């Protein structure tokens, strides 16, 4: 029968059926709980909203992403998320549906293990499987080589793949992603007098980021420009009027990805980790990797990021190498798309982990090549 494809991620859960063309249901992966007491009896307010319901009730809740950096921390909220997904976003009995799950590379093995265990016990699926987000993102782009730079909301990894082989020793995980950019924007928005501190208005700041920010092809020139003119200022209306304006911030915020020092991190910028991951790979395959820098994830959706990225990684690589950056216009869902593609295969229909097999071998089976 049909297989389910749930790509948890941070920030956004996106689920759907295998073989489809886009995830049917997409909603924020948050759980909210009221923080006042409530006085109208008979209102029968439930105790914890979830997803878009919580995103709408923001004003009186306290939101808590149950995934911090690709890792699951609050398992009960994660189970709530999954249950709500299956029973309200898809209206499907999970007992008769093999499900595909994704996770970043270099994660605590206990995370993936407990994931499998809960899947088989609570929801009682017939089978399941856990895949690496970057592999799926490559599947969705019709490639079979090239490095992929996924950057979701919590984590950011490069996975150089060549001819269908993955070179694990060159995988580069980095814990700077959309949530960190949101926080840095919250911080630098203070220097204009705007103060957002609540877990609700963090979402407001996230929207401001998704709408007004962009990468600057040359940081110093854009800084000097915004200093001289005012053609960069754009306004924005909060949920209660009181329009605000931001200038420098629009490109100072996403610049972090190239200068992580802005938030005190010590690692090297996105372009640098990419080039390093290339150089760690064998010399015979470096030209193709140069030519196939795939991108995915919502954080790679800033206006201008591909051009700046090409500029930098060109400055780093030799001159006689052709740099190209595959940035599709729907790359936000590339992981889910690739997951659907893979789950829809038939040469894949014998890689699942059957519930019988799990009962036989216990959750330790996941790390085994039933991967």
């Amino acid at each position: 029968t049909t297989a389910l494809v749930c790509d948890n991620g941070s920030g956004l859960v996106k689920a759907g059926f295998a073989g489809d063309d886009a995830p049917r249901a997409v909603f924020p992966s948050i759980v909210g709980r009221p923080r006042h007491q409530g006085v109208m009896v008979g209102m029968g307010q439930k105790d914890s909203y979830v997803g878009d319901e919580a995103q709408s009730k923001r004003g009186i809740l306290t939101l808590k992403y149950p995934i911090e950096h690709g890792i699951i921390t609050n398992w009960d909220d994660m189970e709530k998320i999954w249950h709500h997904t299956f029973y309200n976003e898809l209206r499907v009995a999970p007992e008769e549906h093999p499900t595909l799950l994704t996770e970043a590379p270099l994660n605590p093995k206990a995370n993936r293990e407990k994931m499998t265990q809960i899947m088989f016990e609570t929801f009682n699926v017939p089978a399941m499987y856990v895949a690496i987000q970057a592999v799926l993102s490559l599947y969705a782009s019709g490639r079979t080589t090239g490095i992929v730079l996924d950057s979701g909301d919590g984590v950011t990894h490069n996975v150089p793949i060549y001819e269908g082989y993955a070179l694990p020793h060159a995988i580069m995980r980095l814990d700077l992603a959309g949530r960190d950019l949101t926080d840095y924007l919250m911080k630098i928005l203070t220097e204009r007098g705007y103060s957002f501190v609540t877990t609700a208005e963090r979402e407001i700041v996230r929207d401001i980021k998704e709408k007004l920010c962009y990468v600057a092809l040359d940081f110093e020139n854009e800084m000097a420009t915004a200093a001289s003119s005012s053609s960069l200022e754009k306004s924005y209306e909060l949920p209660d009027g009181q329009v605000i304006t931001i200038g420098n911030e629009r490109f100072r915020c996403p610049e972090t990805l190239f200068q992580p020092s802005f938030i005190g991190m010590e690692s090297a910028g996105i372009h640098e980790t990419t080039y390093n991951s290339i150089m760690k790979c064998d010399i015979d395959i470096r030209k193709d990797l140069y030519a196939n820098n795939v991108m995915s994830g919502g954080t790679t959706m800033y206006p201008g990021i591909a051009d700046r990225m090409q500029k930098e990684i060109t400055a780093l690589a030799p001159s006689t190498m052709k740099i190209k950056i595959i940035a599709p216009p729907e790359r936000k869902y590339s992981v889910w798309i690739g997951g659907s593609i893979l789950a829809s295969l038939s040469t894949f229909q014998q890689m699942w982990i059957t519930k019988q097999e799990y009962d036989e071998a216990g959750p330790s089976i996941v790390h085994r090549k039933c991967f």
Binding site: L217, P303, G304, D307
Partner: protein
């Protein structure tokens, strides 16, 4: 690249300019609906006051 990003920037400016000029006519026409119904009730209340002006 200059021409490229320039046209891309101004195209985004155009798409937002459209995203606002669309409901430009909307908040124009709601104003006119208000004018109309307000003049209507104006006439109604002017008739009623005059009818009550009798004695």
């Amino acid at each position: 690249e200059d021409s490229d990003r320039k046209y891309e920037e101004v195209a985004r400016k155009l798409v937002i300019l459209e995203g606002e000029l669309e409901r430009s006519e909307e908040r124009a026409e709601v104003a006119e609906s208000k004018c109309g119904d307000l003049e209507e009730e104006l006439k109604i209340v002017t008739n009623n006051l005059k009818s009550l002006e009798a004695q």
